[PDB]
């Protein structure tokens, strides 16, 4: 199994006086930190969110972030003047790394303007997106003047991130392996006919996210299964909903095979009808 760190930023400038920057981090599927506009420190979300870092290490880091947020803000307002862009603006960053077995790691830092990719960090420098607008080339020019920022971003991605994600993995060890069994049941939705029925197979409360549901005729995979979106629960479990458009009654009698990981093999198969 693999657990990428993902640090997200959301920055929104309505006019040149009203603006907010909110952040958050995910280890794998679990959210581990968050950082809102009004708070001047970074909120931890798991007892083990500080990973393996000392309390003074964790401080000089929060300091780097604190100086970045404020400086990032002025710099955008100032690009707006130079590049002739009109408010409102919407910027997102997504930066992080992924530690691989046998000591290696890869990493990333992509930013997006009004919801489309515009640039990223590669090796030592900023680079434009394949097909980004003309002005983007000027922004890159101005970003690459700042030699100190470049080496800081580089140090953080190539060096600090990997060290932090290693700690988090052995310090949030038992939570990353936790397993939670689901409860499932069947029901009947709105008619898509006449004269045909709608079959719904609910699956609630499982964790981790990776799962597998289909509608079965014994051992026969009945495609035309429409699996919904895997939805979130407040307690960090997930909820699925798999449908089947059918002629009544062929079936009854049919089955829904749930293949989750705990359930170490002895999965749940339900038959039409029991409600």
């Amino acid at each position, epitope marked *: 199994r693999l657990f990428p760190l993902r640090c997200l930023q959301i920055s929104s400038f309505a006019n040149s006086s009203w603006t907010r920057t909110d952040g958050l981090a995910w280890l794998g599927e679990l959210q581990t930190h968050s950082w809102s506009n009004d708070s001047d420190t970074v909120r931890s979300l798991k007892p083990w969110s500080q990973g393996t870092f000392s309390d003074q290490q964790w401080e000089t880091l929060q300091h780097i972030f604190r100086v970045y947020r404020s400086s990032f803000t002025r710099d955008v307002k*100032e690009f707006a003047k130079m590049l002739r862009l009109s408010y409102p603006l919407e910027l997102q960053v997504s930066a992080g790394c992924e530690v691989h077995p046998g000591n290696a790691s890869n990493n990333f830092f992509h930013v997006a303007f009004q919801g489309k990719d515009i640039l990223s960090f590669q090796g030592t420098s900023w680079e434009p997106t394949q097909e980004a607008p003309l002005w983007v080339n000027l922004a890159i020019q101005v970003l690459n003047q700042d030699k100190w920022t470049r080496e800081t971003v580089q140090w953080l991605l190539n060096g600090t991130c990997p060290q932090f994600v290693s700690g988090l993995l052995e310090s949030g060890k038992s939570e990353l392996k936790k397993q939670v069994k689901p409860k499932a049941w069947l029901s009947r939705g709105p008619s898509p006919g006449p004269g045909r029925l709608l079959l719904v197979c609910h699956v609630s409360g499982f964790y981790p996210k990776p799962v597998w549901v289909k509608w079965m005729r014994g051992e026969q995979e009945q495609q035309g299964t429409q699996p919904g979106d895997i939805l979130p629960n407040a307690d960090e479990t997930w909820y699925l909903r798999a449908t089947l458009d059918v002629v009544a009654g062929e079936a009854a009698g049919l089955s829904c095979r749930v293949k989750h990981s705990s359930l170490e093999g002895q999965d749940i198969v339900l038959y039409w009808h029991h409600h």
Partner: T-cell receptor
Amino acid sequence: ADIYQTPRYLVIGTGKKITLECSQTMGHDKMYWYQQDPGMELHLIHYSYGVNSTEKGDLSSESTVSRIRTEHFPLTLESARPSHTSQYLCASSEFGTQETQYFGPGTRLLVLE
Amino acid sequence: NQVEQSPQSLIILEGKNCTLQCNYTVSPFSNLRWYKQDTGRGPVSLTIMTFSENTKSNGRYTATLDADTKQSSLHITASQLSDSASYICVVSDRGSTLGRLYFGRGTQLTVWP
């Protein structure tokens, strides 16, 4: 290739129209206008990132600038005033490893009744 | 004023050495520079340095930065009559054109024969 200002000095009646000329035959994109009352530090009144960008520093001055060619960045006062008396200094800057600023000879403006 | 200089003025005999002082509170600090302004003319940049520097040179002029205590100093060697001028200390808060510059009030140097 340097940076120039005309006129060196200027005496003018109040209420009339002043235009200080500044010219730059280096390649530079960025330029600034400073105002230096005597015995005081350089105060920044306008700057421009390049052609068509003209911004202000400070919330006060009643002067306007325009940038339509890279080489010209002229300062304008619509109706002169005693309060406008000062030295005015024009400058540009480049990169190619750190920034570097190049200043002009400046203009001595005196405004009378 | 986040940039402060000392002494206000001083007088030296020619051929003697001297040292001038600059103190700042600017944050973030990116870089700092010394400007020689002859009387009635425009400032001329002498040296620019960063924390990645600790020392710069340009003829008889040598500047040294201490980023920890937030202080720079300028040393002139074997002074000459042509050295008499106002020396201005200026600090920048970004390492790109995307930053403000802050101007000291400057020290007045007078060199006698």
